[model samples]
Target chain A: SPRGCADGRDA
Target chain B: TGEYKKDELLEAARSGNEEKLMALLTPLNVNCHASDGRKSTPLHLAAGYNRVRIVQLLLQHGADVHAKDKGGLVPLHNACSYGHYEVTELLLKHGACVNAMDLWQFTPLHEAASKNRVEVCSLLLSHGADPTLVNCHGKSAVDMAPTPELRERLTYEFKGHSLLQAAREADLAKVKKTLALEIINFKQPQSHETALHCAVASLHPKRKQVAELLLRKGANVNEKNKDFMTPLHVAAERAHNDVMEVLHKHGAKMNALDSLGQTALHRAALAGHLQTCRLLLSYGSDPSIISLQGFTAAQMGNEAVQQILSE
Candidate 1:
């Protein structure tokens, strides 16, 4: 649900 | 071996025995290169603490400052890992690789970050460390900042052309032009409909034309938005037979409308005779209940009510 899963995975 | 206290000197350096260490080293005559295991010199012991006296003794006795043990770590590297600043400075002045990596691929930056040293991160960033380099924290500030800049640059590069921007401004012309270019598909933003989905709801008299243009431009017909309604609601209200014909033709290419599901209830309430006839012809069930709990026939006025009642 996070934008492009950015909030879930480390950049 | 001056032989007076060689064994004691080894014990002192090994055990960090400061008293015996000073007694053994301050004398300027005792050898400090006394080996313990795998040729570890007294300097190796003092390296852990950067002990000034013990280090001076080992250096004076001509112990190999760059000598490494079985692990290939020199005294100075060990000193730096332990943050023994004094001993590290001494070795650096003698030309050690300040950023040397060990068997664990650990450099001073790795050591610092592993220790959660903020000052070390600042120091490494200020020194222009490689942006791809990851420390113990898995990110270098320079790397993180550069990545942020890259993302911002990409956003900036496309700022004027984001779909949400056009949608929010209601720039139908811009939306049409952009869609014509086909740079990106015209899917609705987070709501999951298309620009046509919004334009159809505009109160403007040109709404029908906009909807037609969107359909002509290959906007999807059955791609329901989050609200689950189709653009047919507008077409039905206006009773634009041409638009209805086009919708029917397009619908055949997709799924047929079920009697229970099209916007028949609302069309009946609006009471357009032609629209009601089209709904019935299209097989919209007259018994379908609307949100207000009334059937399409009950909501219709005189002519439509009579038309449904006759059946």
Candidate 2:
């Protein structure tokens, strides 16, 4: 996952 | 005498008779409405019929480029609706508002895209038509696009244009929003410079922060500018070690050569950037690589950078 959306939330 | 001549003028324009149009246009209002029908001006009639010469003649004689008929549609709307390329071009050239909405709030772009007039859609877009504008029915030009391909193209253009702007301004919030709706690898059609390129080269105070955010969002670290300089090259030239570090962490090729075969190391060395050179060197940037002009990083650097390069 990317850093900003690492929580598995949609970017 | 007056209404009769006005009707004649409309007739000549609708019929595509340039000779009769010129003759009747002298004493009559070129912008006169149809006495009884849609109340379209002569320019609207000529534009709708694809009568290029007649449209030009009418515009030359002071036809209102923004004149709207009963439906509140401008000459641009009529030209785009019927896919009349030259007429659309003429209307746009004469300053027709690209986004003038009709009574239905439908812009010329919405009309063209909905009708599958692909060429007209492109022409409208090139003239700064906003694809995100919604009509009375709440559908944007993109939503009204007849094909998925066109819709995707419009979506990309809109998002890419926004991302580049946000990146240039270094507006962290806008860039974050645009990245959330990301076109991470979207390159400008002309310069082929991606949003990451803009962020890296931006002079704003938030430029470094924005560049790092873009990197974290999966922006292509090795994307090149029009001159083939990567974000790494830009960061190196400006001695922006922090940005260079984030880029390197994101997979930026340390030894990537530009158009002149000059790598990021060569740029930092030539600028005498001490810390920038150290960072590039640590990332495995080769100082031994030669440029097109036969210069290596060691040959380019000042005395201060040479001490580091020599070691």
Candidate 3:
């Protein structure tokens, strides 16, 4: 997952 | 103005748009966003739980305020929802912040303000240009989701949405408590037979599972289908909304109830190719092989993957 702002749904 | 989608999903849920119920799956956090090692996932814990002082310190180090969880919630939405005004403020929004971020549930910080009659926060978001309408997945606006009539009424008369439904649409939540302390009647629609539960399942947004659970806690009828003969489960299965489907069933949504076409819930899931829904329906003993009145099996109307799941 990328950082929250970076934008990826991996959270 | 706006932040993430409705972005960020749990591992199995869509990577975009926070999937349904985060609490049900993941470990609950109240410690820190990144306490032990690279606990990026747990970092927002303090702010969300309303620890103003810890938030102040954390703000200095300030992890990506923009980084989202399963839902597109910035730390600000969590703080505001918790009513930690100072923690949810200026230095926060100014630091490359996407101020208007929404979570799976259609709530913005403004909607967060409606969070609990944080009147000043509501005004703060208004000055910052928050859109009160579309606060939730349902047609209701921000004010519409408020537990109290105060915030809803304020947004209605003071702020200008040009209507009452628009005004009441703005709203908020906090304390992480599962209390139904909201306006009970808000669940019921006067102009129609619809309830807020109906809206959540029908809308099928990232926060939908949470919204559906909330409405269920507040006494929404899981079995009440619309005039179209579609229950919330019917809508969920057809739309491939597995998240909503689980909640609807955990709690046997009349598995054999007939739609106008005399189809079963399994029939809907099968025809729609909702593999997840099919999995769930089977878990609850939904008869995939049961033929509809038209003599159709799930595999016949459903897609290939569904055919595989059912067959």
Candidate 4:
């Protein structure tokens, strides 16, 4: 979930 | 009963609300940790200069400065990135790491550099920041030479080794080349000793010739390194006869390294009989006493002792 959210902001 | 009203308050704060958002968020049951699509709390929003509202909400709720968003960005990070000085100070007081690194592999120094904010870099550099290895390229501010092609080309040609050679060989041509090309501003990496110091340390017979030429060209003889040792210390140790001649020629000059501190005495007593004789003859009164209170003659071998006794 954390990675997904961060990736949404461009991980 | 008031989810829409609270959401609107959060939005206003995120847009840098000066008053309306603050009035709404000041209510008793406001949820400062309310997250949006990015999972960024009111603290992150306020810290990012949206509205001071998020900062007030988070502080009132005791939100940790160390708490990270979905991207692992802390409120402190947001405050720093958005250049919110007051919010950053508040977060720091709540125990935020002032030197924290962010997701971009950037420290505060890198952030400052990326922002092209020279003042921040200057402050960090002045605070003993490791300018050399701190950035991605492993280059310090000092290494970032000007982009003048001819200047860079000249530095590439004669920076270190050539400067040393010019000092060693007493090359007037090389010295003039450096001066005319404005490469004299270049400094040694460690000791900060200049090319002229190397010349004074050169043990060749023409070492003094080099020193004289450097002096005439306006090299500062009194320049001392971190250890407070000057070029005169090197001159005394190498025992260059021509150095003494130059000293005599320039009445204004005096050897900075005096007899008691002379590094040459032991070496002369150990190896060169002629050097011992010359030291005795040239510097008789001072050479009579050793730094350790023995006679300079006593420091010599039996042969040197005999020679000194005869003299």
Candidate 5:
């Protein structure tokens, strides 16, 4: 998968 | 007169005097640059110092939200670098770009994450900051995060989104692999729908198998979405008997109420799925429970579903 922005979801 | 006004504007901004700032602000000087210094604007001073009301005044009087200092730092960069969430939020509202890079290509996200400003970091992300972007030295925001745990959390968010995407596509292998990395209950930011919720709502032949896999891996069987609808509610509404059966075995609550106080059986019956209603009933779903509108599952059912509910 292409590198993408980490969204606002919790870890 | 005007020179003193310009000099005092910086002093008021530096001193955080809201009244003095109000008296001196004019369209001509609102965006003035400090000629011999770092060329910092009034917005930069107030934002960095966390003078929220001062920042608000500057914005209203048309201080350029995007104006950069000689160091290539915008007001947003100053706010985030100092962990000022209120000022950071204000800058963003006035169209200050979070991704604007400084002299060293450091974004506001980079500043916030590196400084361990948790709230500022999250706010920047929700408003569209990119966590994966690398600075001039090739360090991403997460790379420079002040602590290991914070970095772990920042990294996991991307993996979680990937897991949800895999679930949506019903890629069982991908789901299993991503789950092995140790997360099965990641929820979307807006919808709060978990990977299991996506799997349950999918049309792929392997969707039930994916749902089963997620449940086996410790996914929340009764996890609620933004509307409080659980995975069983989704499966029951879609009339996916097999998926519902898997969720039931995983301890899904049959009578769990959604935001409207309607149970899975209520949804199935209302949608006229006789077999769905029967499956829910067989699993001990109560038909007598009333929704918020005071309608029982039987009351919402079509004749076919009503017949099964009666039995």
Candidate 6:
């Protein structure tokens, strides 16, 4: 279920 | 010869010699069992990976089965680790390998099989009189070191001289059907909520495909999700158990089904860049557009290989 983003990641 | 001992060993092994190795090194002086850079001696390579004939030849030429590699693993240890069952039996006939011989970390050969979750190899070792009670450096017995609960259960049963989840997990199509007819396992196990099909499809066994088909034929639920909200197909996709995936797909597993995380099997395949599984999942017409709660799609979950297929 890693279909999602790195939720709290910085660009 | 380059890496002098290596050249001698490979020359002996490659030439498949029963006589003096066709090398410059003196056959007697060169330590016929001498290892090379990777700690793999001629005897280790021959007994572990070569033909039984070569194995016998090396032994005749004074290759010590009791010899250790850099890892402190003997020839029998290599054979068991790679599931070379035939060689394993041959080594046993010589009684050269001490069954519970400990490695650097005190890992016995049974620990190798148990941690690998190789049922047949573990069963083979036990059947040939491997001691399972021996503890590793960490004080974990082979049973304690089994990789998963399913594997631990199976190892314990095998050590006790039976198959755990005897019918379903062992890939007995006939017996599984008999049990299914009696409705023994309630299509839902107590701890994992996994059905018989779940266990069968999750097996790394060669008969996994056939067992899964039988389960599906017996009205076992293919879409039944486990505690992790992973279906049989989801588990298959996660591990790229493509053969299992084939049976699940043929029997009409829910291809685009969402898990508790709102991701399909495609999502797992994509994120891990599991090319073969992604290829298979996409071929099942799995919708790759599905998104998760964090607003990511299969499109963004992975790298070049995944994007190559998804794009």
TM-score, one value per model: 0.32, 0.56, 0.33, 0.42, 0.55, 0.39
lDDT of 4 by residue, B72-150 (tens): 5666556544445556556666666555544533444444344343443444433333333343455433344333442
Candidates in order have lDDT scores of 0.51, 0.83, 0.44, 0.52, 0.85, 0.50
**Residue-wise C-alpha lDDT for candidate 1, range B111-204, written one tens digit per residue:** 4343343343334333332334554456532333334544343233343335557889998998777665562245566776567656655667
Candidate 3 local lDDT, residue B151: 55
Best by lDDT: 5
Per-structure clash totals for the candidates: 0, 0, 27, 1, 0, 0
lDDT of 2 by residue, B77-121 (tens): 888888888888988888889999888888999878887888888
Candidate 3 local lDDT, residue B249: 54
Candidate fnat values, all: 0.00, 0.00, 0.00, 0.06, 0.00, 0.00
Q: B1-311, model 6: which lDDT tens digit per residue?
A: 44665566556664556454534334453334444443656655655554567677566655667766655666666565555566666766666544545443444355445446364355454544343445444443454445665455544554344333444367586545545444434546454443444554455665455555555555344445453443444454456455445545555454544543443445555546455445545556454445445434344446654565555
TM-score for predicted model 5 compared with the true structure: 0.55
State which candidate, 2 or 3, has the greater lDDT.
Answer: 2
Question: Which prediction has more favorable TM-score, 2 or 6?
Answer: 2
**In terms of TM-score, how similar is model 4 to the real structure?**
0.42
Ranking by lDDT: 5, 2, 4, 1, 6, 3
Q: What are the per-model DockQ values?
A: 0.02, 0.01, 0.03, 0.10, 0.03, 0.01
Docking class of 6: incorrect
Worst window of 10 by summed lDDT in candidate 2 chain B: B176-185
| lDDT tens digits by residue: candidate 3, B130-162 | 444454444333444465565565454434423
Model 6, TM vs. native = 0.39
Q: What is the interface RMSD of each candidate, in Å?
A: 17.2, 21.0, 9.8, 7.3, 11.2, 19.1
